[PDB]
Amino acid sequence: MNSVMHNDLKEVLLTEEDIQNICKELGAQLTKDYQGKPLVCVGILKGSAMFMSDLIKRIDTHLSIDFMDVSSYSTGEVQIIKDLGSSIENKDVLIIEDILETGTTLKSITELLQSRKVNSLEIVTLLDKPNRRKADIEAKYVGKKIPDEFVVGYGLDYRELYRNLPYIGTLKPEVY
Ligand SMILES: [Cl-]
Ligand SMILES: [Cl-]
Ligand SMILES: [Cl-]
Ligand code: NA
Numbered sequence: 001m002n003s004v005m006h007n008d009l010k011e012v013l014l015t016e017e018d019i020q021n022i023c024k025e026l027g028a029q030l031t032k033d034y035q036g037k038p039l040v041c042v043g044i045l046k047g048s049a050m051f052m053s054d055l056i057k058r059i060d061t062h063l064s065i066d067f068m069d070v071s072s073y074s075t076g077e078v079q080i081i082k083d084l085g086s087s088i089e090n091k092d093v094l095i096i097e098d099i100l101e102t103g104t105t106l107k108s109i110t111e112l113l114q115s116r117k118v119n120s121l122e123i124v125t126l127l128d129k130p131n132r133r134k135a136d137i138e139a140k141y142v143g144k145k146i147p148d149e150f151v152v153g154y155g156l157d158y159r160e161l162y163r164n165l166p167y168i169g170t171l172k173p174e175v176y
Helices: 016-034 048-056 104-114
Strands: 009-014 039-044 063-072 078-082 092-100 120-128 141-145 168-171
Touching: 009 016, 016 048, 016 092, 016 120, 016 141, 039 048, 039 104, 048 063, 048 092, 063 104, 078 104, 092 104, 104 120
Parallel strands: 039 063, 039 092, 092 120, 120 141
Antiparallel strands: 009 168, 063 078
C-alpha cells in the first residue's frame, strides 16, 4: 500500500475525462430513447451509485430514481435486502450497472422487475466483461468492453476500498 493512492495503480483503463465522455454520449442516447417516457433509473447498491449519479446528469428528460440491495443465496436465486421504494407498474425502467460480468444476479433482477408490469426494461452498464457471462443477458447500452482483469475505481472496490477514485484501473500485484 502506497501513501499516494494513484500509486497503487498499475494502469489507468479509463480516466475521469474518458468516463465523463461516456456519460455524456450514453446520456444523449438515453435522452433520445426515453424522452417523454415515465423513466425510472434503478441502481443496485453499492458500486453502481457512482456511475448512475453521473449518468443521470446527462439524461435530459424527466426521470425518477430508485435503488435495490440484493445478495446471492451464482445460482439465479437472489435475496432482496432492500426492494425498490416505489411502484414501477407502467414505468420504463433502466437498470444502471457499473459492470456486467456473469449476469446471473442481474438476470434474476430483470425477471422480478418484469413481473411488476413495467412498460419496458433495459440495462445500461459502464463496463462489460462478456467472456464472464453465465446467464442469457446482454445490455442494450454499454460504455466500454474491457479486458477480464480485476479493476477498481469509480464504484468498483477491492476489499471495500478504491470506490472513490474518479478513474478506473488495475492495481499493482503487490496490493493483492
Ligand atoms: Cl459519480
Ligand atoms: Cl417516474
Ligand atoms: Cl473487476
Ligand atoms: Na457523481
